[PDB]
Amino acid sequence: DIYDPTYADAAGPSPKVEYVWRNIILMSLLHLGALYGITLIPTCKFYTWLWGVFYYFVSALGITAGAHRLWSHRSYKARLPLRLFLIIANTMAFQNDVYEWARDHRAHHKFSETHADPHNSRRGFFFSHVGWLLVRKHPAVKEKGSTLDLSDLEAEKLVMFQRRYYKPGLLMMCFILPTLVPWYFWGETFQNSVFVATFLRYAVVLNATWLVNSAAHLFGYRPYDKNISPRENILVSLGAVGEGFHNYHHSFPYDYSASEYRWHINFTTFFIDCMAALGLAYDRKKVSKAAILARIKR
């Protein structure tokens, strides 16, 4: 389609943008309601804590093992049962559907740190964290991102399926269902069942991944590639469920781990390896220490 060159031309390094006010209000309201959910933590029952933490991890795996490694990068291959687990988990996590998530991410890698990068870190921290979700995509994103080969995803039935039935699926998996089962099973109050079991954990999962774009691209160390910007960040690797070794991963995206070392702080590699031993994941790419050593070259 088209674009307005007033939102593309810039004297400096950042053009003007169109504020999406539907998103600004909703994001603000999710976080305000999350801050309130923090204050309701000591009130909560023990089970809803376990429920909250548990729901956090599965949601993470739906993005980490699922949306990112399996589908965005095609690092490994997953048998049908695991496929179902990850696609359901990805709906629990309510980031954009696997198709759109991978599409943006395949551009995040190939056009890293340009205006074709959906979360361009050159724009700043706030933009890369959540700011890019509060504004219209810079024209270059779909101008250059229309290049990418998304055939592997389009041909995958399950991926396109959740893309269609996403609004119902995400409503259930991310809001209704995670609110009902504390309020109904271990007699949680509806108020805590809302602002903690859903509001708090969903906001937690959001930022935890946002730090992989924001925090991880400005803070850390680069023993693999000095010239690029993603950093090896331990906290982010711990915040995320393993995706914080970003200087490594942008250098080796097809790695079925996101790091040089398996299981180090990679809870997912451990998970994926468990899935492999069960016979549910099978084609793991592991980059030779040869190539990793051949790249101190940066």
Ligand X SMILES: CCCCCCCCCCCCCCCCCC(=O)SCCNC(=O)CCNC(=O)[C@H](O)C(C)(C)COP(=O)(O)OP(=O)(O)OC[C@H]1O[C@@H](n2cnc3c(N)ncnc32)[C@H](O)[C@@H]1OP(=O)(O)O
Ligand Y SMILES: CCCCCCCCCCCCO[C@@H]1O[C@H](CO)[C@@H](O[C@H]2O[C@H](CO)[C@@H](O)[C@H](O)[C@H]2O)[C@H](O)[C@H]1O
State the binding site for substrate. 23, 96, 103-104, 136-137, 210
Given candidates 4, 6, 10, 16, which one binds ligand Y under the rule CB under 6 A?
10
b/e 94-125 (16+ beta carbons within 10 angstroms → b): bbbbbbebbbbbbbbeebbbebbbbbbbebee
Stretch that binds ligand Y, among 74-82, 125-133, 138-146, 172-180 (CB under 6 A): 138-146
What is the spatial distance between Cα 256 and Cα 55, in angstroms, rounded to a whole number? Answer: 23
Q: At what angle do helices 98-110 and 157-164 cross, to 10 degrees?
A: 110
Burial class (CB in 10 A: 0-12, 13-18, 19+), 297: exposed
The one of Zn ion, ligand Y, ligand X, none whose footprint includes residue 140, by CB under 5 to 8 A per kind, is ligand Y
Q: Which of 152, 173, 61 is nearest to 103 (CA)?
A: 152
**Which C-beta is closer to ligand Y: that of 10 or that of 25?**
10
Instruction: Please give the annotated binding residues for Fe cation, written as ranges.
Output: 68, 73, 105, 108-109, 217, 246, 249-250
Binding-site size, ligand Y (CB under 6 A): 7
Stretch that binds ligand X, among 37-45, 136-144, 175-183, 287-295 (CB under 6 A): 136-144
- Lay out the site mask for ligand X across 186-215 (x = CB under 6 A, - = otherwise): -------------------xx-xx--xx--
Given candidates 23, 28, 39, 43, which one binds ligand X under the rule CB under 6 A?
23
Please tell me whether residue 8 binds ligand Y under the rule CB under 6 A. yes
What is the spatial distance between Cα 206 and Cα 27, in angstroms, rounded to a whole number? Answer: 10
CB 89 within 8 Å of CB 61: yes
The one of ligand X, Zn ion, ligand Y, none whose footprint includes residue 20, by CB under 5 to 8 A per kind, is ligand X
3-state helix, strand, coil in the chain (%, to 5): 60, 0, 40
Please tell me whether residue 241 binds ligand X under the rule CB under 6 A. yes
Dig out the tokens for 191 from the structure.
């108020």
Dig out the tokens for 245 from the structure.
């070794």
Stretch that binds ligand X, among 47-55, 103-111, 158-166, 175-183 (CB under 6 A): 103-111
What is the spatial distance between Cα 231 and Cα 222, in angstroms, rounded to a whole number? Answer: 6
Please tell me whether residue 68 binds ligand X under the rule CB under 6 A. yes
Contact footprint for ligand X (CB under 6 A): 20, 23, 60, 63-64, 68, 94-96, 100, 103-105, 107-108, 118, 133, 136-137, 141-142, 145-146, 205-206, 208-209, 212-213, 240-241, 243
